Structure 1
């Protein structure tokens, strides 16, 4: 689905969405990227919604990178009220300026119209990008 195997701890505190993406952010694997303009918990099921929209969009062809991963467990109570925490029930924290997704090996006009679909499945505003000198060398 997308999810770790093996966790150290089952549940973990919410924390803030403060700041800028802190890495990720420079477009390392592909010809075109999708970058986050807003912070959000992006869900294993939103990610896979986007991934499939793109493969469906081209031919089973192309190449797709993803590059954000849902390692943060997301609890919810049932309709109860208050005794303990839990349960269940996975997100990836995503700050502004991060490259998620990022396709390659496809025509610009394909990638861009697929990346546009892809971001319609996301809770945040997004930006399509290309690739650069600015994405350096390393």
Structure 2
């Protein structure tokens, strides 16, 4: 999960999400990696879920890194209200992730390990992903 604990605005307007990754598809960290496929928010709920399922499966495992960060406020309105009158609320604390972005990466593992790990992990995630090695990624800072 994790997030800023008091950042700036309790509410910010959802947004239009097209594509470009903005940058962040290479490495310098993990040997194996998971890259997003569809332009979307990914919940810190799903985020710590992947975190779990992953470290979960490979116990005693090495370190896993997250380049990304869930810094977006969902504006949630109360259940069965009526329109207008206000706005949503600081719920659903998620990250903006567009295709190409490396959500997360592993190192110290095995081949098959990193495979199955990132496999189930990304399976959890609210979309689909790509499993990747570490080669052409060489250089981009």
Shared fold, TM over 0.5: yes
When residues 84 and 137 of structure 1 are mapped into structure 2, their CA distance, relative to the original with a 3 A threshold, is: same
Kindly report structure 1 stretches of 4+ aligned residues shifted beyond 4 Å: 80-89
* Cross-structure match for 1:2: 2
Give how far 1:6 is off. 2.0
When residues 87 and 121 of structure 1 are mapped into structure 2, their CA distance, relative to the original with a 3 A threshold, is: farther
- Tell me the distance in 2 between the aligned counterparts of 1:119 and 1:81: 35
Whether the aligned pair in 2 keeps the contact of 1:11 and 1:86 (CA below 8 Å) is: no
Give how far 1:135 is off. 3.0
SS of the equivalent of 2:112 reads helix
Flag structure 2 segments of 5+ consecutive residues without an equivalent.
none
Alpha-carbon displacement from aligned partner over 1:94-134 (angstroms, at most 9, x marks no partner): 00001011111111110111000101111111000001133
SS of the equivalent of 2:119 reads helix
- Tell me the distance in 1 between the aligned counterparts of 2:88 and 2:108: 38
Match for residue 132 of structure 1 among 118, 132, 135: 135
Flag structure 1 segments of 5+ consecutive residues without an equivalent.
none
Whether the aligned pair in 2 keeps the contact of 1:26 and 1:99 (CA below 8 Å) is: yes
When residues 66 and 83 of structure 1 are mapped into structure 2, their CA distance, relative to the original with a 3 A threshold, is: same
Give how far 1:83 is off. 5.9
Aligned-residue Cα RMSD (Å) equals 2.0
When residues 2 and 23 of structure 1 are mapped into structure 2, their CA distance, relative to the original with a 3 A threshold, is: same
TM-score (norm: length of structure 1): 0.89
Give how far 1:75 is off. 1.3
Question: Which structure carries more strand by proportion?
Answer: 2
Give how far 1:27 is off. 2.2
When residues 127 and 105 of structure 1 are mapped into structure 2, their CA distance, relative to the original with a 3 A threshold, is: same
Alpha-carbon displacement from aligned partner over 1:32-51 (angstroms, at most 9, x marks no partner): 00000111110010000000
